[PDB]
Design a binder for this molecule. Structure first.
Ligand SMILES: C#CCN(C)Cc1nc([C@]2(O)CN[C@@H](c3nc(-c4ccc(C(F)(F)F)cc4)no3)C2)cs1
Length: 330
């Protein structure tokens, strides 16, 4: 089997991408944030504290003929920005782009933190990291991809995110029309539960390539590109007036600037992020200070190849017995 679904930016900045997901019988379609950096499928629901729901579409398990309470199971998760959610668990039929998993754990939120309430466009998350990170207790649950894998034509999914435009998540096949050149595959460590890999270095703009190993994770659920402070300083030093602002929380730059590209290494191959992809616009409405798309990982303890990086590439998440990651230009 295969599936294919379109993913769409939630706003003009590509702050996140949402993908429609069918849950239950008859189908209830919710727009979920596919997150290769976590492993829980959780939804706003008829159980979510009413004061914490503000425009989201909710899953109502009592209206699904295929929903079953996973008795005694609870879940609780936090994310890298400090946001969090928790609740109980149902199993139900879940379909993404024509690919169906029966008995998928659907984690129903009883509580969500303020940032989730405030994002009316995100109805929940669909985790695509390794199932060892799933938070369901006392019986840990598998991700949608892990449950689907044995049925797929090939044990893979691909992320083809757009720049200020929709893109595609495919399951079970590689669309050879969606990229240019070849896909370069690189080894993955699952030791932390992430799609963790080692970039071979970087370049700023038209500068020469710096060969250096950068461990990090491929994370579709993180907006920006977080790299070591040395690398990030070398990038922003090329932008007149760019500076790290503790009050804003990262590097800002004059909105009048044209940004240089940023290249990262995948083995002997290179992915080039155009400068425009690094522009996240005014820090507040009307400001002439703009927020940078490349930020330091120093405070978070892990380098994150988030959407800024991934949207410059066609990315293969290969969940074969020995997992790997593939990157192609597009
Ligand atoms: C700090 C630190 C050390 N480590 C935890 C950093 C890491 N952090 C992650 C992620 O938690 C998994 N992938 C990212 C992700 N964030 C979201 C998200 C968050 C908030 C909302 C909102 F604003 F709606 F509430 C929406 C989506 N979705 O995915 C972050 C992996 S490693």
């Amino acid at each position: 089997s295969t599936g294919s679904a379109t993913t769409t930016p939630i706003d003009s900045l590509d702050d996140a991408y949402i993908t429609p997901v069918q849950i239950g019988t008859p189908a209830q379609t919710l727009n979920l944030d596919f997150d290769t950096g976590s492993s829980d499928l959780w939804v706003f629901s008829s159980e979510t504290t009413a004061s914490e729901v503000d425009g989201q579409t909710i899953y109502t398990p009592s209206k699904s003929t295929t929903a079953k309470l996973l008795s005694g199971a609870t879940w609780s998760i936090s994310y890298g920005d400090g946001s969090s959610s928790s609740g109980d668990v149902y199993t139900d039929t879940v379909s993404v782009g024509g690919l169906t998993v029966t008995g998928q754990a659907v984690e129903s939120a009883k509580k969500v933190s303020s940032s989730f309430t405030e994002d009316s466009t995100i109805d929940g998350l669909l985790g695509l990291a390794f199932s060892t990170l799933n938070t369901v207790s006392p019986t840990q649950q598998k991700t949608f991809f892990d449950n689907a894998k044995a049925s797929l034509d090939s044990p893979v999914f691909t992320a083809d995110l757009g720049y200020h435009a929709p893109g595609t998540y495919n399951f079970g096949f590689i669309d050879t029309t969606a990229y240019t050149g070849s896909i370069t595959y690189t080894a993955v460590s699952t030791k932390q539960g992430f799609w963790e890999w080692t970039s071979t270095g970087y370049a700023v703009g038209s500068g020469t390539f710096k060969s250096t190993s950068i461990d990090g994770i491929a994370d579709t659920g993180t907006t920006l590109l977080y790299l070591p402070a040395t690398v990030v300083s070398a990038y922003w030093a090329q932008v007149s007036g760019a500076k790290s602002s503790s009050s804003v929380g990262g590097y800002v730059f004059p909105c009048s600037a044209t940004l240089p590209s940023f290249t990262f290494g995948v083995g002997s191959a290179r992915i080039v992020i155009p400068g425009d992809y690094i522009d996240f616009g005014p820090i507040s409405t009307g400001s002439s200070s703009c927020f940078g798309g490349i930020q330091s990982s120093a405070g978070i303890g892990i380098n994150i190849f988030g959407d800024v990086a991934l949207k410059a590439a066609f990315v293969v998440f290969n969940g074969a017995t020995t997992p790997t990651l593939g990157f192609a230009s597009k």
